[PDB]
Amino acid sequence: MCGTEGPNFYVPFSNKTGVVRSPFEAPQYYLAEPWQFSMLAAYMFLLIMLGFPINFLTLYVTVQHKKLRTPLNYILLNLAVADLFMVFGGFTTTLYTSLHGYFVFGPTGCNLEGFFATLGGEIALWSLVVLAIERYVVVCKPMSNFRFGENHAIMGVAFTWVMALACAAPPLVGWSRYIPEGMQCSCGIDYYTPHEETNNESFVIYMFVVHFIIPLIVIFFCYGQLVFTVKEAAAQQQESATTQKAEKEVTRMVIIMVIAFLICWLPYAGVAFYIFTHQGSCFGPIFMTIPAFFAKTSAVYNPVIYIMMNKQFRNCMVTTLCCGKN
Template identity: 65%
Template sequence: MVWDGGIEPNGTEGKNFYIPMSNRTGVVRSPFEYEQYYMVDPMIYKLLAFYMFFLICTGTPINALTLLVTAQNKKLRQPLNFILVNLAVAGLIMCAFGFTITITSAINGYFILGATACAVEGFMATLGGEVALWSLVVLAVERYIVVCKPMGSFKFSGTHAGAGVLFTWIMAMACAAPPLFGWSRYLPEGMQCSCGPDYYTLAPGYNNESYVIYMFVVHFFTPVFIIFFTYGSLVLTVKAAAAQQQESESTQKAEREVTRMCILMVFGFLVAWVPYASFAGWIFMNKGAAFTAMTAAIPAFFAKSSALYNPVIYVLLNKQFRNCMLSTIGMGGMVDDETSVSASKTEVSSAL
């Protein structure tokens, strides 16, 4: 809805931007040309820049080290680890192409690089985030197949793992590319320092509503269902096996570890995506509603933080990867050659 010569009561829409503030006072300016300090105190922009710098300085080394130790250690180059490497690549994409541009914008107080850079940043950040999201889905399915054995004695090979990795990139491109070609568009969001899909407007010619519905059905609700189903089934399977071998301390320990890891994985996924999806859904269903720049920014940066805590949950808590990393940086961590090839807590399947 638009009122009074294009001025909305709770927001201002311009060429390739939407500011969550009425321009009745005349203070609203394009986020590509002017500082946006009328929305948020300048110190908040500095804190945002510091936070993104922190994510780069922590997320980049962890993800890069994951790739390095995988290249150096043959025992890590197992099919079930392919998706962990893919997750690290997604994290590096977010750090290199998303966070650096956000820092530049936050330091200057507006999206200084222009609308084209906004589209590029939005695409790369969405691509990296979606590759990570679908990597978590594929990882859950792979563990479900290995532990729950829904297909019987199925041998998980490198071909299957490669297909899983390819699937994540196809799904990510199916989400990130459409706004570049006219199905929705990328706009500065929150504090106008980073860009994402247009959930905010009904701009003619972009079909934003159909894109948002597609995003929610295919790229949120479907992954949520798959992850809950697979990890729920995995926990039930492991608990049932442990109940049959109550005298085995190793089996009981494995059951507790698998349950803990599943809870952490589901929790990490929900922390990354539920705040962002919930806010986007609220905006979509309440066009023109009032919200602040900070309200919009916080959920987006929950999702961005996954570039750091995804490798912590999925890699650093993996004993085999952790030992290889410690050995690589000269802090001990001798790798046990007898460690199962699973390397992602699915080694419990051999113990049950």
């Protein structure tokens, strides 16, 4: 008797006192004090105020600078759009619901907010996977007669949308489901109940294998091989101080990107490990949503790492912000 069940929700709070209410109807101030809902709102406001400008500016400077519109940069624009889906499908709705203390848009809005927020995060995840694959192909040259062009980059972008849809769409039609989660102000995949009517168990396995294990392996393999190839070529040209300088910065950047990916990935692994190692206590709204809570900031630091640290985008952003000068 850990929470309270109802049609389309699971409030992680016991109803022996009789105070639990539908998260679609009344504020959940027994899960958390009102000031903590306000802090959830303040957190959403921070993500909005940092997330929108950085990601919109990425799309904007690409319009003004011809040299950014190269096929290898298409996946980065896809990343920027995905973060905007998270900013407007998730953060802004959650800022609005948190100030009410519950999900005021009903079960239909729960599927909408759940779908688009899950879609945004999925497109971003697979954009990082596709970018790793593309860089591996260009550098390690595993295909002998291959040249990466416009059609290939479009293929990679469409691939992320397909992978994002095959995660975000099944809960709309009977495999798992979308319900309020955590403090019940935002909606997502039901990892919290074993709803047999929608076969939640098998969807969690499928999420774990395809959308969690595989992205980590691909990112690690591609960047591992890329670093190996680059170190290998630089070893054959140690008389070039710039070759060694480029090798050091490629390695340093791959380390930064892998560590950033692990900072978002490991919390899920730790919490899932705890849920399956102990598996004997009730998990409050906060605990099993802690990985999701901190993974939201990826809408801010991913464009910082993949775009603002790119030498091209940075100078074009400075030129755009400073009205064409400097």
